[PDB]
Design a protein around this motif. Structure first.
Motif, PDB file in Angstrom:
ATOM      1  N   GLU A   1       0.809  -1.254   0.000  1.00  0.00           N
ATOM      2  CA  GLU A   1       0.000   0.000   0.000  1.00  0.00           C
ATOM      3  C   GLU A   1       0.825   1.278   0.000  1.00  0.00           C
ATOM      4  O   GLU A   1       0.485   2.215  -0.715  1.00  0.00           O
ATOM      5  N   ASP A   2       1.891   1.309   0.789  1.00  0.00           N
ATOM      6  CA  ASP A   2       2.739   2.498   0.872  1.00  0.00           C
ATOM      7  C   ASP A   2       4.155   2.091   1.058  1.00  0.00           C
ATOM      8  O   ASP A   2       4.540   1.606   2.118  1.00  0.00           O
ATOM      9  N   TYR A   3       4.953   2.266   0.030  1.00  0.00           N
ATOM     10  CA  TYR A   3       6.337   1.879   0.133  1.00  0.00           C
ATOM     11  C   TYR A   3       7.187   2.795   1.013  1.00  0.00           C
ATOM     12  O   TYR A   3       8.316   2.430   1.369  1.00  0.00           O
ATOM     13  N   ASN A   4       6.690   3.971   1.404  1.00  0.00           N
ATOM     14  CA  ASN A   4       7.446   4.826   2.298  1.00  0.00           C
ATOM     15  C   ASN A   4       7.469   4.380   3.751  1.00  0.00           C
ATOM     16  O   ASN A   4       8.022   5.050   4.618  1.00  0.00           O
TER      17      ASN A   4
ATOM     18  N   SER B   1      18.221   0.955  -9.558  1.00  0.00           N
ATOM     19  CA  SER B   1      18.004   0.307 -10.853  1.00  0.00           C
ATOM     20  C   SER B   1      17.505   1.311 -11.880  1.00  0.00           C
ATOM     21  O   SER B   1      16.834   2.275 -11.527  1.00  0.00           O
ATOM     22  N   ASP B   2      17.917   1.092 -13.123  1.00  0.00           N
ATOM     23  CA  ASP B   2      17.451   1.886 -14.264  1.00  0.00           C
ATOM     24  C   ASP B   2      16.400   1.156 -15.110  1.00  0.00           C
ATOM     25  O   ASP B   2      16.029   1.627 -16.195  1.00  0.00           O
ATOM     26  N   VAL B   3      15.957   0.004 -14.612  1.00  0.00           N
ATOM     27  CA  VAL B   3      14.982  -0.814 -15.316  1.00  0.00           C
ATOM     28  C   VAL B   3      13.797  -1.194 -14.483  1.00  0.00           C
ATOM     29  O   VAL B   3      12.685  -1.312 -15.040  1.00  0.00           O
ATOM     30  N   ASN B   4      14.005  -1.404 -13.187  1.00  0.00           N
ATOM     31  CA  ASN B   4      12.891  -1.632 -12.260  1.00  0.00           C
ATOM     32  C   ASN B   4      12.667  -0.323 -11.509  1.00  0.00           C
ATOM     33  O   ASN B   4      13.481   0.011 -10.667  1.00  0.00           O
ATOM     34  N   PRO B   5      11.625   0.446 -11.842  1.00  0.00           N
ATOM     35  CA  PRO B   5      11.415   1.759 -11.193  1.00  0.00           C
ATOM     36  C   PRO B   5      10.971   1.611  -9.734  1.00  0.00           C
ATOM     37  O   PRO B   5      11.045   2.573  -8.947  1.00  0.00           O
ATOM     38  N   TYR B   6      10.511   0.409  -9.378  1.00  0.00           N
ATOM     39  CA  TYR B   6      10.074   0.101  -8.018  1.00  0.00           C
ATOM     40  C   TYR B   6      11.269  -0.333  -7.203  1.00  0.00           C
ATOM     41  O   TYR B   6      11.522  -1.521  -6.969  1.00  0.00           O
TER      42      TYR B   6
ATOM     43  N   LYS C   1      15.164   4.309  -5.769  1.00  0.00           N
ATOM     44  CA  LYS C   1      14.954   5.629  -6.373  1.00  0.00           C
ATOM     45  C   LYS C   1      13.575   6.215  -5.985  1.00  0.00           C
ATOM     46  O   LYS C   1      13.411   7.431  -6.027  1.00  0.00           O
ATOM     47  N   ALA C   2      12.620   5.351  -5.653  1.00  0.00           N
ATOM     48  CA  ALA C   2      11.247   5.811  -5.436  1.00  0.00           C
ATOM     49  C   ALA C   2      10.957   6.373  -4.078  1.00  0.00           C
ATOM     50  O   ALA C   2       9.951   7.056  -3.896  1.00  0.00           O
TER      51      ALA C   2
ATOM     52  N   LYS D   1      11.519   8.091  -0.101  1.00  0.00           N
ATOM     53  CA  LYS D   1      12.050   9.293   0.579  1.00  0.00           C
ATOM     54  C   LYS D   1      13.341   9.034   1.360  1.00  0.00           C
ATOM     55  O   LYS D   1      14.214   9.917   1.433  1.00  0.00           O
TER      56      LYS D   1
ATOM     57  N   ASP E   1      16.809  10.143   0.256  1.00  0.00           N
ATOM     58  CA  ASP E   1      16.495  11.078  -0.816  1.00  0.00           C
ATOM     59  C   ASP E   1      16.505  10.392  -2.176  1.00  0.00           C
ATOM     60  O   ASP E   1      16.891  11.007  -3.192  1.00  0.00           O
TER      61      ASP E   1
ATOM     62  N   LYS F   1      18.443   8.077  -3.228  1.00  0.00           N
ATOM     63  CA  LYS F   1      19.782   7.782  -3.683  1.00  0.00           C
ATOM     64  C   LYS F   1      20.422   6.597  -2.955  1.00  0.00           C
ATOM     65  O   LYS F   1      21.595   6.268  -3.201  1.00  0.00           O
TER      66      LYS F   1
END
Ligand code: NA
Ligand code: NA
Lengths: 438, 431
Positions: A44-47, A86-91, A94-95, A97, A100, A102
């Motif tokens: 539900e919320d990856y954060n 990853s530059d291919v799995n956006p999940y 990078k997603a 908080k 930041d 990174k």
């Protein structure tokens, strides 16, 4: 010619022990892990992912204290979320908080492994992806939609594997959750990627190849005898002859097998009191295995020619819990206490080895090791103790392989003798040692 | 009691023209747009998204030059990729190398709109998400997993709408692709979100509510007469007809919208940038015919503009848009004469005998559509002759007729439902 390990398989046998660290979004959800639910209910919320005290050095040191020589991290598992940039799995990291966007926990992890002298490996779960609709390797749906989506998913997985095999240095193993299936069907064509970029990395596993085999249970043991040889070059149920009891074959191996597919034992550390937890969950602090149970498992894995993998669980702060770390240290200390300093030791390329003890004294354990690069030559052996000037048999066995630990009722002895009564080639015994352990 | 617009609908009529900018990952693939294939097949490499020259100020400036008063950006469309810094949709600008994962085109865009005095709106494409395998809100599969993913996706839509409605200031409109369906069935429950956080934002649309209606074609025109009133408070189910004319007796205010791609010439009809379409922008004269048959028929016109893979409105498109604004000004900025009043009859004395070929009539739309039948006459050689006849006026009517040498023009409202409130009756001579 006898089957023997490939050069890159020697580090499998020699390590003896390693650790796998499971970490995914649901560790931060405040409730117990439900595998069935997790595989089919996207997060539900990856954060919720916010390990503000993350320290992979602490993870690696904790594993090292147990005797672990390699350490593996779940880059992905079942949610689809990836613990790297990853530059291919956006999940992925990078997603979020945290850090930041990174952060790269795979990077932190492989760096920590190398810092402390553990060989890093990477686990990748491609079988279940709740976000993307993958169940048992298959994209859900039908018709052209499903054919095209499966083709895409296979490429996505190939690309993820490529990132992990090219940007994080040389790896010990790549471990796929339940393997990587069949590259001619639903599975990604990953073996060529691992061969190209990671030629000395253990490939575990798909329908075509397994560089080691799961030993048939998550008890942290294998059965006895336990051979490294196997009838096929993989552990896949579709490639083993149909009349074989496959679990028995995983647990024991096949002394007549032409392929080198050695035994792996595994267990979560948090396996006591009716639990069996690969992930951190609340209120499991006291469900770590007692030291006595861990030692029983060590003797029935490492002492039965299998490398043992412990499942460790970083918590929502990003650390291995204190109690877990202490138990791990206790395990390593106890392995050293029992087996680091023998009463006596001897080696030789012989069918019989006599160990003089120096003086009459108590003995209750022996270790035997073959030079594994030259194969499993020993087929039947006996150990005798010279007690009151007369030899008596204290134990008998079959397989030895990389390491055999034998424990028997203590005897007051002046010497021990190992006789290999059956062998397929002249034994190459690198270690025959005696111990007294209370 | 006459139906009238809601206070927040006044800006719909008053704007008269706006622009929508479509942008999604396939713009960057070097080939023509294939909707059917784009909807279904995920993007193989999203790092093709690299508009090195991106400048949303240029997009807004280009639209402003045409006469656009609002501008709308597709935050999402069909791939599932989001043009903002989302905390719920991971397939967004956080995922790309472009701008080091820190770009927010929605933010750039709304800032640009405000800088140039255009009201910003947002288009949210949610029926299709190729990354996630969503087809008209539905997830595929036979069981619990598919049902779970489908319900989760509905929540994702609600959460994205929440982000867009709370982090980017006050919005002109929220446009859901094909409408957001029925919140009691497959559609996300988005009206309460928009109402709470964007109470003065035009909601377009779902089964319960449409603040304006699509006029039934993508020709940049509506049919005539064109009434703002409608029998239901939404545009959901001859439907094409009803959309084409409205219902003069309808109790709900659901005013007409006309739309067209700028790149609609020569057999093409492109809402997105694709290669080799530079010569497929509509000629100026054609754009003007459309303006007269949208804006001049009580319908606000939305132009579809196409930022290119470099991140700009193409040069030829920008020039054509400027030409359009310049020409609207040339034809209609300076009347021969103008008059207003709350009367059924208005006479425009011209000053001297001269040629006349256009009139503009405007009702004070806040007070409703009062005019039902009208005629315009011209005094030619001292005698009145009828030059045109109509029905609906609404916010704006543009009448073009064969030129006459007249000394006066007279508007007569022969049928009305209340005293007309005419804010503008003007005459022009356009060469
Ligand atoms: Na949990
Ligand atoms: Na394209």
């Amino acid at each position: 010619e006898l089957p023997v390990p490939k050069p890159h398989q020697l580090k499998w046998h020699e390590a003896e022990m390693g650790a796998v660290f499971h970490y995914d979004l649901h560790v931060f959800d405040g409730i117990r892990y439900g595998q069935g639910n997790n595989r089919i209910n996207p997060i539900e919320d990856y954060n919720i992912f916010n390990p503000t005290e993350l320290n992979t050095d602490q993870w690696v040191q904790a594993a090292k204290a147990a005797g672990c020589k390699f350490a593996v991290l779940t880059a992905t598992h079942e949610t689809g979320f990836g613990l790297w940039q990853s530059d291919v799995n956006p999940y992925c990291l990078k997603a979020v908080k945290w850090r930041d966007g990174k952060g790269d926990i795979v990077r932190d992890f492989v760096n920590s492994c190398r810092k402390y002298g553990l060989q890093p490996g990477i686990y990748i779960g491609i079988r279940w992806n709740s976000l993307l609709g993958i169940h048992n390797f298959k994209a859900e749906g039908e018709g052209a939609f499903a054919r095209n989506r499966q083709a895409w998913y296979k490429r996505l997985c190939e690309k993820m594997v490529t990132e992990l095999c090219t940007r994080y240095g040389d790896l010990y193993m790549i471990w796929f959750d339940g393997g990587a299936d069949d590259p001619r069907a639903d599975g990604p064509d990953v073996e060529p990627i691992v061969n190209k970029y990671q030629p000395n990395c253990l490939f575990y596993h798909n329908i075509d190849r397994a560089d080691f085999r799961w030993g048939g249970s998550e008890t942290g043991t294998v059965e006895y005898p336990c051979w490294s040889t196997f009838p096929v070059p993989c552990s896949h149920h579709k490639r083993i002859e149909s009349s074989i009891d496959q679990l028995e074959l995983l647990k024991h191996g096949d002394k007549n097998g032409r392929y080198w597919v050695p035994a792996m034992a595994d267990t979560p550390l948090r396996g006591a009191n009716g639990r069996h937890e690969w992930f951190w969950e609340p209120d499991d602090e006291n469900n770590i295995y007692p030291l006595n149970t861990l030692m029983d498992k060590y003797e029935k894995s490492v002492g039965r020619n299998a490398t043992l993998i412990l499942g460790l669980t970083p918590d929502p702060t990003g650390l291995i819990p204190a109690g877990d770390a202490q138990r791990l240290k206790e395990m390593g200390d106890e392995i050293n206490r029992r087996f680091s300093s023998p009463i006596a030791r001897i080696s030789g390329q012989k069918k019989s080895l006599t160990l003089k003890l120096g003086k009459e004294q108590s003995v209750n354990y022996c270790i035997i090791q073959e030079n594994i690069k030259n194969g499993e030559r020993i087929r039947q052996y006996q150990i005798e103790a010279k007690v009151n000037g007369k030899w008596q048999t204290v134990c008998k066995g079959e397989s030895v392989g990389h390491k055999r630990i034998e424990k028997f009722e203590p005897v007051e002895a002046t010497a021990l003798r190992l006789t290999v009564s059956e062998s397929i080639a002249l034994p190459d015994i690198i270690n025959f040692s005696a111990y007294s352990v209370k």
